[PDB]
Amino acid sequence: PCKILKCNSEFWSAEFCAALRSYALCTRRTARTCRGDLAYHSAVHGIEDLMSQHNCS
């Protein structure tokens, strides 16, 4: 059912934030199925952290 481990193998395997927003979209494409998996909420919060670190507008 849940498939956040593909985003964990897609973003993690790939100066601007044109890629971090791609990871945010990868995680939000399954914004319902992974309500329970620790790795889903961990990846969402980590994307939030990296969003306010490299200054992404």
Partner: protein, 105 residues
């Protein structure tokens, strides 16, 4: 520079923004493992045959073999109450949540 041992690690779900889905608890003691894994290994570490062999080889020649690492070898669960996808409240026993012993692997 002390032996592989268990240390305090406090987990606060509010700090991680998981307040938006976790009901209770909001924080717990999880512990973490930290310390040197050099030869010889202690009884309470109770390691794997591979861990023993790699440690011994690292002792013989540290250039050809790197030391093993200090990691959790026994864990306990905790029970979390949350709201899943279908807007249902769930009491679930999540496993491997509290480090209970450390060892070399």
């Amino acid at each position: 520079k002390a032996r592989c041992s268990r240390k305090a690690l406090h987990v606060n779900f509010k700090d991680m923004g998981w307040d938006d889905w976790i009901i209770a608890p909001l924080e717990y003691e999880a512990f973490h493992c930290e310390g040197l894994c050099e030869f010889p290994l202690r009884s309470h570490l109770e390691p794997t045959n591979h861990a023993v062999i790699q440690t011994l080889m690292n002792s013989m020649d540290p250039e050809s073999t790197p030391p093993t690492c200090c990691v959790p070898t026994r864990l306990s669960p905790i029970s979390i109450l949350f709201i899943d996808s279908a807007n249902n409240v769930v009491y679930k026993q999540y496993e491997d949540m509290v480090v209970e012993s450390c060892g070399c692997r």
